[PDB]
Amino acid sequence: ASRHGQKGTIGITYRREDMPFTAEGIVPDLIINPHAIPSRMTVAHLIECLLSKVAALSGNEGDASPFTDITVEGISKLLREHGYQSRGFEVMYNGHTGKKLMAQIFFGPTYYQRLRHMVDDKIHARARGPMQVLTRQPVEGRSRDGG
Amino acid sequence: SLHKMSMMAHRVKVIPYSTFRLNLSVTSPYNADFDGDEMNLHVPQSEETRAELSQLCAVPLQIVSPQSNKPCMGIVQDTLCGIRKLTLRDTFIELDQVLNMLYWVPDWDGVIPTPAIIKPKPLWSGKQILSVAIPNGIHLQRFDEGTTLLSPKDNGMLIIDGQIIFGVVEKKTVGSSNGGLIHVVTREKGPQVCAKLFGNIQKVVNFWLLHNGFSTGIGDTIADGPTMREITETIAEAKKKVLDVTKEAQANLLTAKHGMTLRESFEDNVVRFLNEARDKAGRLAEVNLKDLNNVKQMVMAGSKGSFINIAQMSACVGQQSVEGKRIAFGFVDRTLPHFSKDDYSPESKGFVENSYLRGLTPQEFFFHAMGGREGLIDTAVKTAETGYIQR
Amino acid sequence: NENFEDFDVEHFSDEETYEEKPQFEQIRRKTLKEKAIPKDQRATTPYMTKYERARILGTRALQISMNAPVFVDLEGETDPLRIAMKELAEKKIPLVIRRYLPDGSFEDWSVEELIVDL
Amino acid sequence: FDMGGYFIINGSEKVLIAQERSAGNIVQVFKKAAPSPISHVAEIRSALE
Amino acid sequence: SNTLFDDIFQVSEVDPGRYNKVCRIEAASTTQDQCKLTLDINVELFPVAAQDSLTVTIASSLNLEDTPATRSWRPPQAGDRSLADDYDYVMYGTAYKFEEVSKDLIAVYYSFGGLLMRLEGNYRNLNNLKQENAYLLIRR
Amino acid sequence: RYRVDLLNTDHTLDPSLLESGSEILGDLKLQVLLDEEYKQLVKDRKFLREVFVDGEANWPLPVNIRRIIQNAQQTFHIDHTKPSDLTIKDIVLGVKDLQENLLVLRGKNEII
Amino acid sequence: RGNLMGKRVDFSARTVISGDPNLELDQVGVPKSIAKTLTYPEVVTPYNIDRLTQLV
Amino acid sequence: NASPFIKRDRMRRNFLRMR
Amino acid sequence: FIVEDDESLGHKELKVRKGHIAKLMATEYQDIDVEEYTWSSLLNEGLVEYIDAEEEESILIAMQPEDLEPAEDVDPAKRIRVSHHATTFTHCEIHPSMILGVAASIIPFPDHNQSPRNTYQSAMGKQAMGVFLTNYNVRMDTMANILYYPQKPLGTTRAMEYLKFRELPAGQNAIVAIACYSGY
Amino acid sequence: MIVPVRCFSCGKVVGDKWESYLNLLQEDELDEGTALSRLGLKRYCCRRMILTHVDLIEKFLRYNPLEKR
Amino acid sequence: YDRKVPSPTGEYVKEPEWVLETDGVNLSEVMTVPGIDPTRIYTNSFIDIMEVLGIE
Amino acid sequence: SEGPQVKIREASKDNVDFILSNVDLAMANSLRRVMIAEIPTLAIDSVEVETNTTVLADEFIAHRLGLIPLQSMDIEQLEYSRDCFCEDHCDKCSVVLTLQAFGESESTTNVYSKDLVIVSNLMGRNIGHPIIQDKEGNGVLICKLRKGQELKLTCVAKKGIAKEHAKWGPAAAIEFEYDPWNKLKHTDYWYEQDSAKEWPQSKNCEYEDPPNEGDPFDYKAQADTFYMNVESVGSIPVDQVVVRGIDTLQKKVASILLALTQMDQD
Amino acid sequence: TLSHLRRTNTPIGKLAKPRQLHNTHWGLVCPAETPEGQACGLVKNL
Amino acid sequence: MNAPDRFELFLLGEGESKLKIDPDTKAPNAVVITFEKEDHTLGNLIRAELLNDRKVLFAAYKVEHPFFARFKLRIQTTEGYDPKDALKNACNSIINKLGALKTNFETEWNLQTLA
Ligand SMILES: [Mg+2]
Ligand SMILES: [Zn+2]
Ligand SMILES: [Zn+2]
């Protein structure tokens, strides 16, 4: 999960030589779908990513309090002063073939939280198993190999 | 499993990880998104049962839904987005990419399509490459507003002899809508050919968007200086009109509409004025954003988002409503203890004039929280009531 | 157990909402031979329905599964369902269908004479 | 960094959730339904410590 | 084989529109005052400005031999000779519409993978165009 | 759109649209068939205007006729320049027999 | 309502889901452990004696 | 615009310099 | 906060001054030898006051002392913050960001989000996985999840300084790229 | 809890660079950004490695060991 | 309202019409008053339609 | 010589930056991919814990010791454990280390990677040494102990490629750029007002001529003149990274050669 | 742990609408922190 | 749980060849060859160098699934020319070019003396 309700499972895991990369060699930790941002109108994920990028460059942790006078323009000016693009885009390259990506990718650090719903605690299979004492039907629960 | 399109017979492909994996097109009838959702699998135990499951409940046999005689499945999400950027006028594909895009189709007829750009450089257009996924003998004709046999906006859609003539491919062509490519193919050629069409188009568009790239960012949700200036002027003139209406009903010279009292007419006029203010500001914001803007590309593709999402993310959130009215007076004659008594101004009864990217004031943040709580409680009660009604 | 804020609807659980709102012949008779309608006034459709097709493939696949004499020349096909589809495709399956009317009478139909259009 | 504020019963940490109730000794007026023979009801939930 | 139509056109305006790679040009023939063209041009591969004379030829093939796409396309080999060596912008596409503007004005529409043409004029020289795939050879 | 007259000039049929068009003008039995077809079309139009009080043109119906017509046009290479080989009597007889060939209820009595 | 209309069944599995755009539309990706657990009885015929013998 | 950083260590040094 | 008549400046003004702020910082830095100056000093000298939901009916509160208090060119990106056009405040907010809850103060810029997303996080940050207590090795909890390398967030809130979130984090600063790379 | 040996993204070793960073902050009165730049961590992927890490073992090791020899 | 009326030329004209909306359902005597059209009166509640005007 | 051409820009003990011209896109991309993934490297593979009373988990320390880089100059002489004739491991196919540490001090004792010592005979190879980079002389911080804690364990380090695990990766970050002035137009620059103002120029833009803004787009131009920067982790020298990646690509295409010749004769 | 110790709860047979966020809830309960289950709005956090 | 062996990305299995040829009937003089146990690294290079040959009419590859380390490569050449010979010449040229890369990088680093 993000810090903005942007939860989601891992689709797939790529190694580094497949997964795309910027001109500075920074391969991202995690690729998220663009379409999740504007349908939910989650703008604070984008501003958090920009502020975290500026914080990582400048070495000072960023203030993200709600009702301060901190705007996207000031963070954009700071990121421009640190030598990157003002809105956070980086020109990255395809990992499989090395060709440049035609569209520029929003990129940067963002605080993510791992949630307790591991897949290993949720997978379930049963061909035959213990039946209930009452109705001769398969039992309740994945710990008891139920139906 | 509220409807029969969510009990469907698939074919097993054994994969070496711990998740059920399934095609992205069938996530619309399943009402499924991979935010932690689980699904169940049932194995038949006899030849009769397996045979009727494969011949009745199979995935290709249920592309058209008997609910509303339109295809319940469709090219959705980013494969809907990439197919808009593949078949634009601007998009031309070089030889080293054309050969891989042709090889990704399993039922490719094996002949290289002649380029739409012969010389100075051999270039294929995106419509030509996508037409290989469409089988032959499929003919579709559709016109939007202001669409002719010449297409300056390049809207509409024309498919002749298994080839795309003109028109970008968007939600109106491959999406879950009647009169699209999916419905025509599954009613003229069969279910199996339409399933193969789903596979071929998803393979081609996913490979092209893989080697092309797509994103969205914070800069996609910001308008420039003058555009936000006239958006602020629109909000200011709406506040001026509301102040005028407040003075007119304050002078007791404002007439009451039929079937409603003075205050009901006052609230109705204020709500209509602020809603048209939000609509005008959002329309200006949508006009300002360019073709390299990605939210505009997504909304034009019909994959995700809407006009009102850009309106709230760029120009103005708008009026926040609780139980169909403005923010009620929970205190004595005022909404919050930070205003004076008897304040009927829009910002004191729940108008969020500041957009999301410009942040929210604490009062409008609390009002937006009240609106969100309205939405959550209404969603939960609606789901429970409609589940009981369905049963 | 667990404590999760991931809202998972209990399914088939409408009884919560139920408890929220609890306050507000002439032609055929007996077992004679008039049930068996002869072939010359069969009023049913001569096209085999998708349910009839599904059960014919299922039943023929199960018979071929239990080692029935196959009436067609196979090209090396092994799965029972595909052999049943091949048998029905060139009409070598010797089964009949009793289309049941609501009144208890029935009409017999050979699948050899049934038109397979789907 | 542990802050206390909970009980330990049978080896399990237990927390008393604050229960919300209507205020005592406050007179409140409500309007009943139209088919009811009562127009308005004024009541107090009188309590003493 | 043989050239189905040959003319020269002067462009009156070039419309860039809302695209960054393809511009829609409108051209009128100097020889015929009743025949004109609207054409989508990839202006990167063929830069055309206003008031430019372009030789425009619609043909049925590239080989100089007579005609006998059903054949696969291949990259051009070294030493291959065709009509495309004489022109600077070679197009392949499908005819999809023949409409009668007036009693003598016939208009033919062409589609090069999403690039559009209308060509209108008298039928005495446009009767060679039919329901077949054709090439469009442009030179400056 | 629909009225064809073989005895008048205001609603006449062009002879170039079909092979048997030049000598077909001035016939009586084909004019009788045309008048019957036009009367049936007028009665159907009145029936639709009675059923749909708002007169909405678009309604959900079983078979997409337009797709079949387009499939014929592109399959048999219709260039709309060669005159058709059809007689109007053949068209009328085919349309009349197609309605008889559509069977939903297979009973052979009056009420079915 | 809890044991006749809706009852727990055997030969079933349940797990979380993830998209796989390289599968066909009518194809689902089943985990290998779920494939090893779930069973389907295929009878022995002369047409599949060798495959079933190898699987045994 | 104001600085969007939490730099209280420099505030600590400044206040210890003031004391 | 308490607003006094404050006849020296000719308008309404908060009773707290820079001297009390300096004394609070001095005590806050001596805790980490001067005279003790804690919250009881503010409470007992009339600088702050407790207001419940009863008294919020019949008072008037201001957002910031720097904007809504004094008598009245603007940044094109800053939000429209109204000053209410009236200076008769009797109380002032200490800080508006203290209207949030605990796990809803974890959100960076909660005012730049749709409110259901803030609700989803504030019910989802409880579901996060990270170090909960520093003596997890000696506790026989029934279930416990500990991240190997919990990192404090880059974009942080002032409010989580007092929630000890930078001391006990619940996630990692992952390099996020917002892109449709492969369709997975 | 203690500093990771490698940046998860790029893989440059930073496990040996933590006590040097604490030394630069502790006695040289430096800002965090300049001290991070002097260690050769020029990409922000490595900068969030050392800047954002909390030293939890300084709270862990204060407990007495379970087995003492 | 803007109803669709069959034009004498054959088209469908968007003709305005003054239609009365009434709070409270009554059909026993409202449809029998003069000056209105009782062949097209519609009721929001179908129970009174069934009990007054027909089950079909 | 005819073929690809290299021109170095910067050099260091663990950093190289060069320019690779007259070569296709796919060769440079495949070189980058084998440089990330296919280079053999010696790193700790299995951990055998004798005594652990530290505050951290045992498998925590095992994973950390796995990610510690080890010197792999003579790793080509070493043999794969899977292809070796051993039961589990031997000196010809592995390197065995031990780590022993005690909290004899009142203050905290920092267990570094310099405390790793080799206990098996190397027979004159130059592998198995933990890498020291900083000027303090100490290695990578393995663990921390207080007074009274013990950490005794034994590591068996084999060779593997980075496809199996990231512990066997010597590449770290690899900068890879081509055509910095967008003259091939492989990127359509996103912009708000102007595409030349909001996008800063890269470092490489001084090594190519700027566009003249009047010349047309060159359609026959291909992609060459790559800018490469390798930052070695320390396991092998930074130029040995490049030459070993080239050698690994040689061996991979040679394996394709051998397979094609083997099925050619049959 | 902090949000659990600072939790509240409200019992739901009344004709009010307790699941909503009231105007007097400013500064005393969190505007957005509620479970998404059947106790949405009923459980409020200070 | 169901995670495959991490060495199963680069070890050939039992009874499985390094290459699998399959002569495609779909187009004349066309073959599809399955590379077992590689990724896009070899595929992009082989695709580009087959495209560099003038006698190869068609040459493309695809990875059927990112889980399985294998990919298919279709090559169609001019009549009278074996696509296996086209692959042979292409990989010979690949060896030549990157061996020249080896020698050039080695001699330039021997030129450098500031280390
Ligand atoms: Mg879901
Ligand atoms: Zn890094
Ligand atoms: Zn050995």
**In three state form, how does the secondary structure of chain I look?**
CEEECCCCCCCCEECCCHHHHHHHHHHHHHHCCCCCCCHHHHHHCCCCCCCCCCHHHHCCEECCCCCCCCCCCCCCCCCCCCCCCCCCCCEECCCHHHHCCCCCCCCCCHHHCCHHHHHHHHCCCCCECCCCCCCCCCCCCCCCCCCCCCECCCEECCHHHCCCCCCCCCCEEEEEEEECCCCC
CATH class of C32-118: alpha beta
The residue behind tokens 């139209």 is: D34
C113 CA: distance to closest CA in chain B (Å): 21
Q: Please state the domain extents for chain L.
A: 1-40+167-266, 41-166
Do β-strands D18-19 and M8-9 pair in parallel, antiparallel, or remain unpaired?
parallel
Number of alpha carbons in the 13 Å side-chain half-sphere of residue B133: 26
- Pair B64, E90: CB distance under 8 Å: no
Q: What share of chain A is helix, strand, coil (3-state, %, to 5)?
A: 20, 20, 60
Instruction: Give chain G's radius of gyration (CA, Å).
Output: 16
**Which ligand has its closest atom nearest to the C-alpha of A7?**
1
Report d(CA I150, CA B352) in Å as an integer.
Answer: 37
Amino acid (one-letter) located at I8: S
- Identify all chain M residues contacting C5, using CB atoms and an 8 Å cutoff: 35-37
Cα–Cα dist A106/A36, whole Å: 13
* Residue B69, amino acid: N
| Number of neighbours of residue L12 by Cβ within 10 angstroms | 12
Tokens of I87: 């200076």
I139, exposed or middle or buried, with CB in 10 Å at 0-12, 13-18, 19+?
Answer: exposed
Q: Which of N50, N64, N44, L31 is nearest to A96 (CA)?
A: N44
Query: CA I123, CA M43: separation in Å to the nearest integer?
Result: 11
Residue ranges covered by each domain of chain N: 1-115
Pair type for strands G12-19 and B20-22: parallel
Task: For chains E and N, count residue pairs whose Cβ atoms are closer than 8 Å.
Answer: 7
C88 within 8 A of C111, measured Cβ to Cβ: yes
SS3 content of chain D, % helix, strand, coil (to 5): 0, 35, 65
Resolution of the deposited coordinates, in angstroms?
Answer: 4.0
Nearest ligand to the CA atom of J41: 2
Experimentally determined by: cryo-EM
Question: Which residues lie below 8 Å from residue I80, measured CB to CB, with a gap of 6+?
Answer: B232, B353, B354, B361
CA–CA–CA angle L178, L179, L183 (5° rounding): 150
Report the residue of A63, A72, A76 to disrupt the H interface, i.e. the one with the largest count of H CBs within 10 Å. A63
Q: Which of I:105-144 have CB within 8 Å of J?
A: 131, 134-135, 137-138
- 3-state helix vs strand vs coil in chain N, percent to 5: 40, 25, 35
Q: Which chains have at least 3 CB atom pairs separated by less than 8 Å from chain G?
A: A, B, C, I, N
Q: Which residues contact B70 (CB under 8 A, 6 or more apart)?
A: B64, B176, B177, B178, B183
The Å distance, Cα M41 to ligand 1 centre, comes to: 22
Can you tell me whether residue F57 is helix, strand or coil?
coil
Helix (H) or strand (E) holding A72: helix A72-81
Q: B residues 27-86 near C, CB within 8 Å?
A: 36, 46-52, 54-56
* Token representation of residue B117: 């750009």
Ligand with smallest separation from the Cα of C7? 1
Query: What is the total count of domains within chain J?
Result: 1
Rounded Cα–Cα distance for residues G45 and L76 (Å): 55
Q: Which of J9, J54, J62, J66 to mutate to test the interface with I (most CBs of I within 10 A)?
A: J54
Between CA A132 and CA A138, with CA A135 as vertex, the angle to 5 degrees is: 45
Contact between B374 and M20 using a beta-carbon 8 Å cutoff: yes
CB within 8 Å of N42: residues ≥ 6 apart: L30, L252, L253, L256, N35
Helix, strand, coil distribution of chain L in percent, nearest 5: 25, 30, 50
Task: Check E98 against F77: CB less than 8 A apart.
Answer: no
* H-only helix segments in chain F: 29-51, 65-75, 88-101
Residues B5 and B68: their CA atoms lie apart, in Å, by 12
Is the CB of N95 inside 8 Å of chain L's CB atoms?
Answer: yes
Residue L104 vs residues C34, E49, L101: alpha-carbon distances, Å: 104, 85, 9
B135 DSSP 8-state letter: P
Say whether B391 sits in a helix, a strand or coil.
Answer: coil
**L107, HSE (Cβ side, Cα atoms, 13 Å):** 1
- Give the list of residues 6+ apart from residue E19 with CB closer than 8 angstroms, or none: B88, B89, B90
Q: Would you call H13 and J31 a contact, using CB atoms and an 8 Å cutoff?
A: no
Q: Which residues are CB-contacts of L164 (< 8 A; sequence separation ≥ 6)?
A: N6, N7, N9, N10
- The 3-class SS string of L225-255 reads CEEEEEECCCCCCHHHHHHHHHHHHHHHHHH
Beta bridge partners of B351: B319
- Residue J22 CA to residue J5 CA, distance in Å, equals 16
Q: Is M43 an interface residue toward I (CB < 8 Å)?
A: no
Closest CA to E28 of E52, E61, E49: E52
Tokens for I162, please give them. 């007092």
Residue of chain N whose alpha carbon sits nearest to that of L240: N106
Start-to-end Cα distance in chain D: 37
Facing H1 at nearest CB: one of A61, A64, A71: A71
**Residues whose CB is under 5 A from ligand 2 (ion)?**
J 7, 9-10, 45-46
DSSP tag of C72 = S
CA gap K55, N17 in Å, rounded: 78
- Six token digits for residue B64: 């058209």
- What whole-number distance in Å separates Cα of residue L90 and Cα of residue L81? 8
Cross-strand bridge partners of residue N80 = none
The burial of F74, by beta-carbon neighbours within 10 Å (0-12 exposed, 13-18 middle, 19 or more buried), is given as middle
Comparing C-alpha atoms, which of M34, M2, M27 is closest to residue I115? Answer: M34
Q: Which residues contact A86 (CB under 8 A, 6 or more apart)?
A: A76, A77, A79, A80, B219, L198
- Would you call D49 helix, strand, or coil by DSSP? coil
Comparing alpha-carbon positions, the chain I residue that sits nearest to L61 is I148
Q: Which of I44, L161, A98 is nearest to N37 (CA)?
A: L161
Beta bridge partners of L144: L110
Rounded CA-CA distance A139/A131 in Å is 6
- Contact of L116 with J33, CB cutoff 8 Å: no
Cα gap F55→L46, rounded to integer Å: 81
Q: Please tell me which residue of chain A has the smallest CA distance to H10.
A: A60
**CB count, 10 Å around CB of K43?**
17
Burial of N1 from C-beta contacts in 10 A (0-12 / 13-18 / 19+)? exposed
Asked if E77 lies within 8 A of N27 by C-beta distance, the reply is no
- Beta carbons of L91 and L123 less than 8 angstroms apart: yes
C-beta atoms of D15 and M2 within 8 A: no
Dmax over Cα atoms in chain E, in whole Å?
48
Q: CA F88: distance to chain centroid?
A: 9
> Which residues are within 8 A (CB) of I49 and not within 5 positions of it... i.e. 6 or more apart?
I1, I2, I43, I91
Helices (H), chain N: 40-52, 83-111
* Residue B95 contacts N where some CB pair is shorter than 8 Å: yes
Residues of J in contact with L146 (CB under 8 A): 61, 65
Residue A5 has, within 13 A of its CA and on its CB side, a CA count of: 26
Q: Read off the DSSP letter of residue L17.
A: E
Q: How far is CA B103 from CA N59, N71, N88, in A?
A: 9, 12, 22
**Closest to E73 (Cβ–Cβ): which among B112, B164, B165?**
B112
Cβ within 8 Å, pair L55-J60 = yes
Strand E22-29 to C96-100 pairing: unpaired
SS3 call for L126: coil
* Dist. CA L134 → ligand 2 center (Å): 17
Q: Which residues of C touch I127 (CB under 8 A)?
A: 4-6
Q: Which two tokens stand for residue B342?
A: 């008897």
CA pair distance I15, I32, nearest whole angstrom: 27
In terms of residues, how long is chain D?
49
Strand order in the sheet with L15-21: L5-11, L15-21, L226-231, L174-178
Radius of gyration of chain N (CA): 18
Residue with tokens 């940046």: J7
C-alpha G4 – ligand 3 centre gap (Å): 63
Query: Which residues, chain by chain, have CB under 5 Å from ion ligand 1?
Result: B 33, 35, 37
E22 within 8 A of B127, measured Cβ to Cβ: no
Q: What Å distances lie between residue E46 and E5, E9, E50, E53, L216, CA to CA? A: 21, 15, 13, 13, 9
Q: Cα of L95 to ligand 3 centre, how many Å?
A: 10
Nearest CA in chain B to I84: B339
**DSSP-derived 3-state class of residue F32:** helix
Contact partners, residue I38, CB within 8 Å, separation at least 6: I27
Edge-first strand listing for the sheet containing I172-178: A30-32, I172-178, A105-112, A89-90
**b/e per residue, I63-97, with b = 16+ CB within 10 A?**
bbbeebbeeeeeeebbbebbebeebebbbbbebbb
Q: Please count the CA atoms within 13 angstroms of the CA of C81 that sit on its side-chain side.
A: 15
Q: How distant, in Å, are the alpha carbons of B356, I41, I44, J26 from that of I37?
A: 40, 6, 11, 29
Tokens representing residue C74 in the block: 């196979």
Q: How many CB atoms lie within 10 A of CB B49?
A: 13
Q: What are phi and psi of L6, to 5 degrees?
A: -120, 140
C-alpha span between B195 and B176 (Å, rounded): 14
* Ligand with minimal distance to L95 CA: 3
- Write out the residue range of the structural domain in which residue J57 sits: 1-69
Query: Does B touch I (3+ CB pairs < 8 Å)?
Result: yes
Residue A49, judged by CB atoms within 10 A of its CB (0-12, 13-18, 19+), counts as buried
Query: What is the residue whose two structure tokens read 């696969």?
Result: E72
What span, in angstroms and rounded, lies between the C-alpha atoms of L113 and L67? 11
Structure tokens at B92: 């031309």
What is the number of the ligand closest to the CA of L79? 3
Q: What residues does I3 pair with on adjacent strands?
A: I14
Of B218, L162, L236, J41, give the one whose Cα is nearest residue A24. J41
Q: Would you list which residues of chain G are within 8 Å, Cβ to Cβ, of chain A?
A: 3, 7-19, 31, 33-34, 37-39
Domains held by chain E: number: 1
**Whole-number Å distance between alpha carbons of B87 and B101:** 14
K54 contacts K39 by C-beta, under 8 angstroms = no
CA distance L61 to L67: 10
Ramachandran category for residue B77: left, alpha or beta (phi over 0 → left; psi -120 to 50 → alpha): left
Cβ-in-10-Å burial (0-12, 13-18, 19+) of B251 comes to exposed
A127 CA to chain N: closest CA distance, Å? 18
Q: Are B137 and B188 in contact (CB under 8 A)?
A: yes
- What is the Å distance from ligand 2's center to J49 Cα? 7
Please state, in angstroms and rounded to a whole number, the distance separating the CA atoms of residues M16 and M20.
10
Helix (H, G, I), strand (E, B) or coil at B2: coil
Task: Return the number of other C-beta atoms located less than 10 Å from residue F104's C-beta.
Answer: 6
Give L172-220 as a DSSP string. --EEEEE-TT-TT-------SS-TTTSS---GGGGGSPPP-SSSPP-SS
The reply to whether residue L60 touches residue I148, judged by beta carbons under 8 angstroms, is yes
Cβ–Cβ gap A38/B356 under 8 Å: no
Q: Is the peptide bond before L216 cis (omega within 30 degrees of 0)?
A: no
Strands (E), C4-118: 36-37, 96-100, 106-110
Contact flag A120-N1 (C-beta cutoff 8 Å): yes
What is the residue type of C53? R
From chain E, pick out residues whose CB is under 8 angstroms from the CB of B89: 19, 21-22, 40, 114-115
Amino acid identity at C81:
L
Distance, CA L93 to ligand 3 centroid (Å)?
Answer: 4
Residues spanned by the domain of E138: 1-140
Element (H, E) at C81: helix C80-89
Could you tell me which residues come within 8 angstroms of residue L90 by beta carbon, excluding any fewer than 6 positions away? L84
- Could you please report the per-residue DSSP string of B304-363? S--HHHHIIIII--EE--BTTBS---SSSSSSSTTS-SS---GGGTTEE-S-STT---HH
Say if residues B292 and B298 touch (Cβ distance below 8 Å): no
Instruction: At B315, list the tokens.
Output: 């120009």
Interface contact A106-B19, CB threshold 8 A? no
3-state DSSP assignment of residue J20: helix
Least CB–CB distance from I134: residue in J51, J53, J60: J60
* Alpha-helix runs per DSSP H in B155-293: 171-174, 181-188, 191-212, 225-250, 262-288
Mode of pairing for the β-strands spanning K12-16 and L5-11:
unpaired
DSSP state of J39: T
Residue N47 and residue N41 in contact, taking contact as beta carbons nearer than 8 Å: no
Six token digits for residue D43: 């009541």
Alpha-carbon torsion (F1, F34, F67, E71), positive or negative: negative
